[PDB]
Amino acid sequence: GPEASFGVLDREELEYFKQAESTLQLDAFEAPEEKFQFVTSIIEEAKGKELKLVTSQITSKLMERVILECDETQLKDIFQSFNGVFFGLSCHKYASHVLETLFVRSAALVERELLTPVTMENMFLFMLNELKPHLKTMMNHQYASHVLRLLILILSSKTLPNNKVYQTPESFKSELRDIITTLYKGFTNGAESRSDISQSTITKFREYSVDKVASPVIQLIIQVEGIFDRDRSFWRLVFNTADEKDPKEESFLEYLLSDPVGSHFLENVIGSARLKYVERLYRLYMKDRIVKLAKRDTTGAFVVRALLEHLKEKDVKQILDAVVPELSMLLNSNMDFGTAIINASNKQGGYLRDDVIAQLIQKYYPEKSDAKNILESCLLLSASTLGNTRDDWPTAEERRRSVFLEQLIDYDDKFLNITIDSMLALPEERLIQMCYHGVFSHVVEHVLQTTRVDIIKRKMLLNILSKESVNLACNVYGSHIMDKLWEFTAKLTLYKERIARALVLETEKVKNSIYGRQVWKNWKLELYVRKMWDWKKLIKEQEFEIF
RNA sequence: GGAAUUGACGG
């Protein structure tokens, strides 16, 4: 990071802040003002050495904790102290992250001053002016380019890191338009007009669009260019506009279709190109190849998903015609292509819906065979973290497969039935385990849909789950299953009495648990004790309401 | 009162 010199803290300064963070995440505060007073206390010892605290791996975390938990005056004080060295920080391994926090808080505060009126608006504008000669540099920089991305979001009232948007004064809008065109001008060696750009500077721009750090910045600009440029200069920098293939564009499109970064870029950008330009790329370069591309799970499949969302009725149907006969084979690796087709089929009024269900079942629960078990097919239950002495935590593919199963259960009743049968085919032993599993407990919970599961299947699930009433009651996850059971147990009151009895026998264990005492409420167990007839009455009112 | 290394780039 030669872009500025910050130096380092000494062991004395290190230990003070190393200790402030300790006692700050300890969160042993006995009031809010006490915790605030401690933050102010930190900001205080931090004055004059802010550039050092923010560029250290030991204390940069601390600084954004501070940026989030501090005053709006103090926030303006911290921002003001980064004056003159914003580019340096922007390009810095640790500081670039703090500038990001700083800027999101700042953006929130800028709205409060817009909707309830040195102001934060002017402060932001100062730093912006300070970065403008460096934007093209920043775009390619492995740290700075994230700050440039964020800035463009804020300036366009798009949504920010860590699902909220913020409104902006007109100057922010004017600044955005200024820096888009500054980049555009600085990407075209001049120039006269669209019609006067060399096929070598078009190639050089295309080259940026598949760069691992420049590409998201170019996606973003294309995403927000439409706000002023009703001609969309940057799109037209990348793709052509005539009804025929161009050998350079074609060679380029094939690379996008086979390259991870270029796949992202094509898919993120189709979601914001004008339909006429997207239909052109489809018909020219993909239409007659749609299955071959669909089979490219890591590159290009994703472009097919984007076509399915942003093309119009007639054409997403053609793609569905091509791809649904292939779906079960495509699910062998790329499960998320399943979601794109389910969603697309629904968007077109259940188009080919029966065939999609046929295919899903063909893959995850093929009628013909034995050992049919959608928990093995779809979650790979046997080769999973489920039930280890090895002290492993649930994985991200586990969470991903679980969510896919759940959406399958939402999709149709056939799948709800299939996984219930699959759960009963398990050894009791193993179904119980899933209830204690951070990720898989959600799958059990998802099955407990009273009006949707016939009373015989309910009763048999209840034969298993009931054995563990108390244990489920006191478990982080099992307690969420036990709550669902209050309703599931409708028209089956023998199982209600049996469960409520079990919980009550072990009352002091059940209460005096964080989770147990909530189950106690949800099952109205206090009524079960004080006023049985009133408890029974609730049961009857439940059965009537649900049936 | 609970789910985490997604197909690209950062502690």
Curated annotation (Swiss-Prot):
Keyword terms: Nucleus, Repeat, Ribosome biogenesis, rRNA processing
Domain called PUM-HD: residue spans: 6-349
Gene3D superfamilies cross-referenced by the UniProt entry: Leucine-rich Repeat Variant
Keyword rRNA processing in annotation: yes
GO biological process, one term: endonucleolytic cleavage to generate mature 5'-end of SSU-rRNA from (SSU-rRNA, 5.8S rRNA, LSU-rRNA)
Chain coiled-coil ranges: none
The organism's place on the tree of life at top rank: Eukaryota
UniProt Pumilio repeat ranges: 45-80, 81-116, 130-162, 200-240, 248-282, 283-321, 425-462, 463-501
InterPro entries: ARM-like, ARM-type_fold, NOP9, Pumilio_RNA-bd_rpt
Compartments (UniProt record): Nucleus, Nucleolus
Any Gene Ontology CC annotation: preribosome, small subunit precursor
Gene Ontology molecular function: any one: mRNA binding
PANTHER family: NUCLEOLAR PROTEIN 9
Family recorded in the similarity comment: Belongs to the NOP9 family.
Function: RNA-binding nucleolar protein required for pre-rRNA processing. Component of the 90S pre-ribosome involved in production of 18S rRNA and assembly of small ribosomal subunit. Component of the pre-40S ribosome required for release from the nucleolus.
Subunit architecture: Component of the 90S pre-ribosome. Component of the pre-40S ribosome.
Note: Present with 2930 molecules/cell in log phase SD medium.
Protein name, as recorded: Nucleolar protein 9
Organism of origin: Saccharomyces cerevisiae (strain ATCC 204508 / S288c) (Baker's yeast)
Gene from which the chain derives: NOP9
